[model samples]
Target: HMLKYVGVNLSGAEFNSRKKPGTLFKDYTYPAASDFSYFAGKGMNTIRLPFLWERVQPELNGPLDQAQLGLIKKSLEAAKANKQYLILDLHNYATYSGKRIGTSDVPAGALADLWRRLALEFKDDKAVIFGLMNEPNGISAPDWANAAQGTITAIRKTGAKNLILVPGTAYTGAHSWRSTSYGVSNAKALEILKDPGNNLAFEAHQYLDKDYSGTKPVCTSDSVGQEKLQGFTSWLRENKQKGFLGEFATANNPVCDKALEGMLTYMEKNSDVWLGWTWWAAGAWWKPDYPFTVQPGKDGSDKPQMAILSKYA
Candidate 1:
């Protein structure tokens, strides 16, 4: 691939209900920094840095916290030091429970306002890319596109010209991006970019197993994985081709390795237009055991997931 073949999205920031809210960020120990360095050294060119708003701005109406902001600055600096390009992802993870972070009702305007401040803070840094929102598909495509456009306006006002990634309304459902329309009249899902500036990109995600959340495990076959790629590849073959799969993973199950490999090889062949994707996360959550493996690099041994990454990186 002419473009780099590897990238991973780091873990989202601390949260009020998170297993260990501030262990990574508050303890002053940097977990993501090593993850970034590991990938960069392995030849990956970029990483999507997940930033949480609830942790960053815990008190909804109170004064902004400089310490939290400083942590992000440090995080970004670490990514830069590792020679990795950064995609600054804004995750209202607290909203995962269906409640918006700041005002209890997601204030679209405030979210955009936060980006505007971020853009100004990291102004002129080409290495930094800004993702408007993470997995925003629950509201519907039009709603997400509208909020995205609003955030775009705010970011541009602050002179943030970095590439902006906007996913569908359903946390970037794998099926959503393939839809000919994003709930708009006679318009398609990819058409939301028409109003965006030159630096905009459509963000999408895929997690065949984790997102599936089914009782029985579905084996990840190579053909099955390729079928999923067909969704975005078909659209890319016919359109402006500004889509990027922001997230993907198959847990640490070796059973799914071939499926993961085939899917990534397909991405490698199409790197010219597909951009990149971030693996679910790195490092262990404070929880003893969870549905997903929060940290895949325990004891520094390569997990099946990281092994897949090493293939391209």
Candidate 2:
């Protein structure tokens, strides 16, 4: 059966990009085993695990770091043990060492190579899903589409059956999918994406804030989120494409809660095109006051945001 994931992101995988470059897992921080159990009990059945490209490959198109791979393996083990689906996310923003793939310096083929190696490593892991890249920006729409198609082919060539999630350029924002700032003609770009495996979905992010960036604690009205997603949902239905709300969240405001509730309910009622969703995040390293942090409070209690997410879980 196809799994509908209701989960949160386990971040810190891309933390050391600036300081250490491509050292190892030392810069990353994964959730504890207990955290998995806690979320499972809360009705979450999945986790989007982020990781750095530099840590995985350390050198472009070169050997993958065995040590980093081992640490990631440990995370996979935890997810399996807790009976939760995992999305292995390359947390880089379509760039490695400040070079965007599809550009002259960084060929899209190199990005495909990374997925090829990753597919070889986790191809057999049934519980694992592959998220192509996070928030690809600074690239043209056509180039991003071509790169996505190439990477999808590369992963399929390895005979991996994992469901892949591909995001658009311009941070894959739900509100701005059609915006020019990110260079993503959402409908047009997605129309050009070719997924050979037929086991892929478009990934998108939506935040209820005024700017739709999830950077602030304030949320728009209850209908804002649902309205923001309506167009994308219609596009998915029209094109016979599938989608996943890879990231969405709000602070602990009642207005935010109501908005999220409506948003989730909208997706639930329209599951044909909407696969599932994962909240912005929960990580041990996040500060207690972080706006989007779904991390539990002391004594393993749920955050106010979890109240909204638990409904879908």
Candidate 3:
């Protein structure tokens, strides 16, 4: 059995969301052609391109900025040339221009509005997939789910049947799928989702670090990732829903390396409900020191993590 999608989240466009919003090139950059050329050559079938929501639409319910959206279109073209599926992720973390959603300044309809226009533009592009938001936090799972549902309705209203990826709140971490700290568990809160097009999946991220935030380089244990993912895996199957490991990556050590093999193998064996994944990242901007950078070396050598990914890809 083959997992439908496999690749890395080619980040950069989503960079600098706080210091200088909408400032392209300096504050942030989009994935370059070489980014696709290298990763696609690794047998990755997909790429998740994350960009800031405010960069695309400065106003909550206003028009999309051609300047910013144009840069994104080029990334789409880059992906297309590589024959890869692109997930255009609004990497805003459940906020718009620094104001959290559901606030008087940034209402839920604002999210719906942003996606509706985005769907209208990419309605005919088969290679495009819409990711509502990336790693949303500070919102209850139920509240985020409502915003997600509204956004889905708005997208379907524009006739875009592209597969959508709806993530749970609290950073959508697989390790905390059942945590009540962020209100009702995503396991229960997100079960109300109803996609009009029936083309969508639940997206979750898992990391092997002590905090499960991908910041640390060392893993908690070789098997820690498998243990954390098992709960989310069963939740997807128990609910009869599809799942995608939208973001995941381990460090470069042999311990972390061994852990990635098992985590991906579990997803591979569970392909019935697991759609596949895009590693937490690889992009031109990823520094050589970035802990989770799957970017190949400047000398064109493959990273150790890719040893396992390419086999699955």
Q: Residue by residue across 1-313, what tens digits does model 1's lDDT show?
A: 2444257666646344353235554542334566667677666777777766655565443444577678778878887898777887776532633565334466667677677777787778878888777766446556556666777888887766787876666556554465645354212644655544577766767666634422234434544555676766666657666567777766445556676777788777777667776666654343434334435446665544665677676
Output candidate 1 Cα RMSD. 3.9
| TM-score for candidate 2 | 0.95
Per-residue lDDT for 80 in model 1?
Answer: 82
Model 3 spans with C-alpha error above 4 angstroms = none
Model 3 scores worst on lDDT over the 10 consecutive residues at 16-25
Worst 10 residues of 1 by lDDT: 210-219
Looking at model 1, the pairs that clash are: 9-278, 135-171, 136-169, 137-169, 137-170, 137-171, 138-169, 138-170, 283-295
Q: TM-score: which candidate is best?
A: 3
The Cα local distance difference test for each model comes to 0.63, 0.84, 0.88
TM-score of 1: 0.82
280 in model 1: Cα distance from truth in Å? 1.2
Candidate that beats the other on lDDT, 1 or 3, i.e. the better one:
3
Whole-model lDDT, candidate 1?
Answer: 0.63
Residues 1-313, candidate 2, lDDT per residue (tens digit)?
Answer: 1337889898876776775454444666767777788888889988898888887887788988888788789988888999998998998899987888877778899899999999999999899999999998888777889898999999999999899999988788877776656444867887977777789888999988878878789887978898899878888898898889999987888888888888888998888999889888997878898988888877778888887788678
Model 3 lDDT tens row, 190-229? 9899998999899999988889988889888888877898
Best by lDDT: 3
